[PDB]
Design brief:
part of a larger assembly, 2 chains, A: three-stranded parallel β-sheet, 15 strands, B: 443 residues, mini-chromosome maintenance (MCM) complex, chain A, domain 1, binds adenosine-5'-triphosphate, DNA-binding
Chain lengths: 614, 443
DNA sequence: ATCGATCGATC
DNA sequence: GATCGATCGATAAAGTTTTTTTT
């Protein structure tokens, strides 16, 4: 009587696929969304569906959707039969799956006793210690070679590695098998562990866990180490007796009841597990809006006023961080050197000032950009250093805030308090884009494509004026020449600037005084530079002859003698002298370089090298 | 069936009748040359592979291995007319396949990839030695016919039966010792090399089963990439996880090549040709009988850097090398040349060493801090759970022409520099820390 | 050495 | 054809002082 009930829910779901759940006509929301679900599928060939719990609850008014919530451990090989019937009548090698999502409620892992056998229950948590990608079987072509091995049984169970039922002729049944790798189609899966979220533990009371199984295309979508949700079918799996290997406290005490099956007397257990079907991980005219916004005029000056509300003034350093926010060029000469790919700018200043606000600003504003103080200069992190032999091997790679800044903008501060050894290590990491390691293992060829951001401390907390920063750099010489220039933030105590900064901070520190207007928003600026990165402007004019005389004049200035200091701005900086010069034209969306654009390029070192040169 | 018999006729024509790039019989020339060295190998050109897949894409990505078995027997007749009686020595040939237009890492494998051609990279971890493999199972009964012919044993499946074509009893099958040849077998397991990988995560494992004339081409520690087929072995028994409807993974191989560098090419410098057969060796003499070559080569060696001349005189001289001239029962002679640069911070000294790493044949780039005082030379890695203290060398035993950067890592300068200045003085240095007294040879 | 499973023989 | 008896095959084991880099 559940056969016709299974046949009732077969067509009632099929009739639901004939209709839509569309409430608005031609104000958006085109009708018959499930027909278009078939239409997108017959082009890209992904072999999925996507159904929600809402629109099937609001057709039979819960007379049908409440039935499948307690039975679809059995009803799951029923609804697949109906959609397999409707696909030939509506569309032209075909394996599918049933992907519910978005049930209303969300539980924790501590609430699974008796109703959770055959139900659907969305479960939160985090995920740790994944595994690999192996194939599964679900259907055999195996049969004995007595007379003919073409018997195709199906539905290999949790231990059924032996299809031995109903041969064609009266051959030797259950005598043998031969698992054909030809016709028996497979599917791919993995087995990962989960863990409970941090904001629910009462105390440090050994937070328990369980294990899941991902079956369909859902493999590799579950990035480990994030807050995540799941589908919710439950299952129990024993495995103690098979053909191969021979199968504390009184765990498995219920197993003694489970004895005496029709095959050999044993002690079969039953351990709780979990199966999923679908994962999620929480945590036009807009394309025409860029074409309107690219046809503006003063966007170089519009953007610099609209960077950060937590800062006032300092219009020199606001220009520099925006060029750091975008990227330059990286394509270079053939068969050999890969040149620079970016700029690297620092600002030193007195602590507990407006230096710390940009560092707060960028790490949410930038894609995947990490922040690290860089004080733990002992174990790992900034310094790269492998881990000891653990669980099957030494010489394994480690994390740290350079490798995961691959096209990411890392920011480290406090240069003074590190040791004397890493100051060549990151100096190696700065000049080209790879680092090398050979500590007790083979050489490693890893290429952290990075662009750093720095803020060190002065030698006394107050910057002197009449001297240079050659004393006040508080480090060695050649890393500064390896670096770009700075535009150090100055300080003063005037009667006027403190008053306006006081008014600048109180409306910010209001709960709601949003009268300040940045002429852009955050995200429309964010997608704007994503349009800006898709060019490659090349200098084509003959202003390179104009270019070479400026540096040739420039090098005769900072060298104030044959015995003058070794801060001689050499041919290393000429690459930055053009790779910033293209990037500022890459901001204004111009695909070639004019001599007018490099006017702001020349003085930007030069106004800041006269900051060096007294 | 029977139309595959004509397939061998349909490709021996389609291969041997013409080779591209203005004829010259390129593939028709490299056959006899590897016949001369007696080394049992062939190649296929990718552009020929691009042209010999038009009717064969549905016979490469559909059926990769039994297409090759019928592809193997035509190559005998492709050279039997050329070299007669070559089958009387070693009686066997098998082909190898060159590069392929895929870039698969270790992570990206699914069900659609199996029983087809695959290509993947990684690094070689812990490896075994060389065993012989039976390869021709002359089956043996006890009372009936005890010679069932030399079989064709598979991979790790132990292909046998209880009784067939003699009786139906439980008489087991045994062995005997007449004329069973052996190929060898060497199961390198592979770890994913931490290059192109989203970092901060774990490595992943596979297994690789090599074959007969491809043994010990790799060395432990060195980066390799492999081109072969994919296979499955549903053994129905696994004991790390529970027994489950799953199946393992075995990657058999057809070819193997060394680490590559500057992966930006389109048609060259990824396949190690290095095969100076006709168009090169006939050419390379007149380029040697000119009058200003040494004034031309070292000027044209490092093209990207104009600079002062004398370094390019020296650094070209360094990788050209001298001679390890041995002598009678007396002291040996160093056959090496060891330059040392000194530069201002900002001249091009970091690039010539970077560029010469590509233009060499083998190299290493242990630079700066983190170079261990022992990890350059050989070190002993401790045993796993039932093993012995074995010897697993690091940088200098692998590199014959290695490149270090000993500038001023002063905190570790008093550690490692007592272990590099006896690689030159008492050349071929090795050590016996808590292990075996041995002496490896590293020039 | 003991227990379980499979095969053969007898009713 | 089914049931009972006899013979053959498969099933049970255990760890925690020296030595490496590292902080
Ligand atoms: N003579 C030159 N010709 C061409 N390019 C040069 C020259 N000198 C320096 N450069 C450029 O300057 C860039 C900076 O790298 P550089 O070679 O100066 O590092 P380095 O100072 O040698 O580093 P280290 O001192 O650590 O070895 C290089 O990418 C290189 O292209």
């Amino acid at each position: 009587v559940d056969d016709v009930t299974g046949e009732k829910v077969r067509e009632a779901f099929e009739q639901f696929l004939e209709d839509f759940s569309v409430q608005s006509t031609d104000t958006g929301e085109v009708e018959k969304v499930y027909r278009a679900q078939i239409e997108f599928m017959k082009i890209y060939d992904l072999n999925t569906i996507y159904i929600d719990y809402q629109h099937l609850s609001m057709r039979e008014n819960g007379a049908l959707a409440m039935a499948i919530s307690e039975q679809y451990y059995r009803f799951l090989p029923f609804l697949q039969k109906g959609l397999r019937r409707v696909v030939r009548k509506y569309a032209p090698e075909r394996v599918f799956q049933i992907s519910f999502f978005n049930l209303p409620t969300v539980h924790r892992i501590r609430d699974i006793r008796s109703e959770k056998i055959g139900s659907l229950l969305s479960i939160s948590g985090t995920v740790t210690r994944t595994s690999e990608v192996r194939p599964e079987l679900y259907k055999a072509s195996f049969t004995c070679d007595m007379c003919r091995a073409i018997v195709d049984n199906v539905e290999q169970s949790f231990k059924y590695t032996e299809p031995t039922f109903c041969p064609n002729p009266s051959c030797e049944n259950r005598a043998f098998w031969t698992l054909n790798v030809t016709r028996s189609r497979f599917l791919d899966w993995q087995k990962v562990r989960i863990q409970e979220n941090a904001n629910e533990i009462p105390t440090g009371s050994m937070p328990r866990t369980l294990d899941v199984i991902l079956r369909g295309d859902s493999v590799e979508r579950a990035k480990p180490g994030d807050r995540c949700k799941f589908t919710g079918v439950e299952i129990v799996v024993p495995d103690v007796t098979q053909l191969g290997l021979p199968g504390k406290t009184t765990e498995g005490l219920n197993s003694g009841v489970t004895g005496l099956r029709s095959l050999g007397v044993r002690d079969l257990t039953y351990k709780i597990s979990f199966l999923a079907c679908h994962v999620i991980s929480i945590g036009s005219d807009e394309i025409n809006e860029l074409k309107e916004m690219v046809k503006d005029e003063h966007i170089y000056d519009k953007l610099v006023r609209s960077i950060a509300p937590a800062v006032f003034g300092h219009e020199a350093v606001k220009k520099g961080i925006l060029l750091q926010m975008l990227g330059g060029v990286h394509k270079s000469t053939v068969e050999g050197i890969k040149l620079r790919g970016d700029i690297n700018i620092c600002v030193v200043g007195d602590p507990s000032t407006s230096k710390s606000q940009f560092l707060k600003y960028v790490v949410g504003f930038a894609p995947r950009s990490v922040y690290t103080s860089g004080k733990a200069s002992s174990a790992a992190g900034l310094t790269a250093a492998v881990v000891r032999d653990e669980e099957g091997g030494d010489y394994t790679i480690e994390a740290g805030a350079l490798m995961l800044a691959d096209n990411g903008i890392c920011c480290i501060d406090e240069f003074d308090k590190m040791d004397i050894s890493d100051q060549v290590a990151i100096h190696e990491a700065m000049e080209q884009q790879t680092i090398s390691i050979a500590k007790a293992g083979i050489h490693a060829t890893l290429n952290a494509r990075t662009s750093i951001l720095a803020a060190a401390n002065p030698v006394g907390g107050r910057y002197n004026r009449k001297l240079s920063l050659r004393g006040n750099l508080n480090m060695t010489a050649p890393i500064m020449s390896r670096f770009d220039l700075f535009f150090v933030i100055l300080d003063d105590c005037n009667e006027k600037i403190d008053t306006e900064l006081a008014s600048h901070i109180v409306d910010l520190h209001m709960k709601r005084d949003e009268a300040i207007e940045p002429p852009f928003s955050a995200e429309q600026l964010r997608r704007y530079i994503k349009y800006a990165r898709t060019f490659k402007p090349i200098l084509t004019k003959e202003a390179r002859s104009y270019l070479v005389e400026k540096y040739k004049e420039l090098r005769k200035d900072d060298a104030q003698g044959f015995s003058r200091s070794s801060y001689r701005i050499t041919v290393r900086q000429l690459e930055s002298m053009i790779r910033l010069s293209e990037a500022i034209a890459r901001a204004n969306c111009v695909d070639e370089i004019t001599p007018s654009f490099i006017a702001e390029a020349y003085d930007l070192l030069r106004q800041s090298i006269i900051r060096v040169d007294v | 069936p029977n139309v595959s018999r004509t397939i061998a006729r349909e490709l021996k024509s389609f291969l041997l009748e013409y080779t591209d790039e203005t004829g010259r019989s390129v593939y028709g020339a490299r056959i006899r040359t590897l016949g001369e060295m007696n080394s049992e190998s062939l190649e296929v050109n990718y552009r020929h592979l691009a042209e010999s897949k038009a009717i064969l894409a549905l016979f490469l990505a559909k059926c990769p291995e039994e297409m090759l078995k019928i592809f193997d027997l035509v190559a005998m007749e492709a050279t039997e007319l050329h070299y007669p009686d070559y089958a009387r020595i070693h009686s066997e040939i098998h082909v190898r396949i060159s590069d392929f237009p895929t870039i698969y890492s270790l992570r990206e494998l699914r069900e659609s990839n199996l029983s087809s051609l695959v290509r993947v990279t990684g690094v070689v971890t812990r490896r075994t030695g060389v065993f012989p493999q039976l390869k021709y199972v002359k089956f043996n009964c006890l009372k009936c016919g005890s010679i069932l012919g030399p079989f064709f044993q598979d991979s790790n499946e132990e292909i046998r039966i209880s009784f067939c074509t003699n009786c139906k009893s439980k008489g087991p099958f045994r062995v005997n010792g007449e004329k069973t040849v052996y190929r060898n077998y060497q199961r390198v397991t592979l770890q994913e090399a931490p290059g192109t990988v989203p970092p901060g995560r774990l490595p992943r494992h596979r297994e690789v089963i090599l074959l007969a004339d491809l043994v010990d081409v790799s060395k432990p520690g060195e980066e390799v990439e492999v081109t072969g087929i994919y296979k499955n072995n549903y053994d129905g028994n696994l004991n790390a996880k529970n027994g489950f409807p799953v199946f393992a993974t075995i990657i058999e191989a057809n070819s193997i090549k060394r680490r590559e560098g500057n992966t930006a090419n389109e048609g060259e410098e990824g396949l190690d040709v290095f095969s100076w057969t006709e168009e090169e060796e006939r050419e390379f003499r007149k380029i040697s009988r000119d009058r200003g070559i040494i004034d031309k080569i070292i000027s044209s060696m490092a093209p990207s850097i104009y600079g002062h001349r004398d370094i390019k005189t020296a650094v070209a001289c360094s990788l050209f090398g001298g001679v390890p001239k041995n002598v009678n029962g007396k002291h040996s002679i160093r056959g090496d040349i060891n330059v040392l640069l000194l530069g201002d911070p900002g001249t091009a000294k970091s690039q010539i060493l970077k560029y010469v790493e590509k233009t060499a044949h083998r190299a290493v780039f242990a630079t700066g801090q983190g170079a261990s005082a022992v990890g350059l030379t050989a070190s002993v890695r401790k045993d796993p759970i039932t093993k012995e203290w074995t010897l697993e060398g690091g940088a200098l035993v692998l590199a014959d022409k290695g490149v270090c950067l000993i500038d001023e890592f002063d905190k570790m300068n008093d550690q490692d520099r007592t272990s590099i200045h006896e690689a030159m003085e008492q050349q071929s240095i090795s050590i016996s820390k808590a292990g075996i007294v041995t002496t490896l040879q590293a020039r």
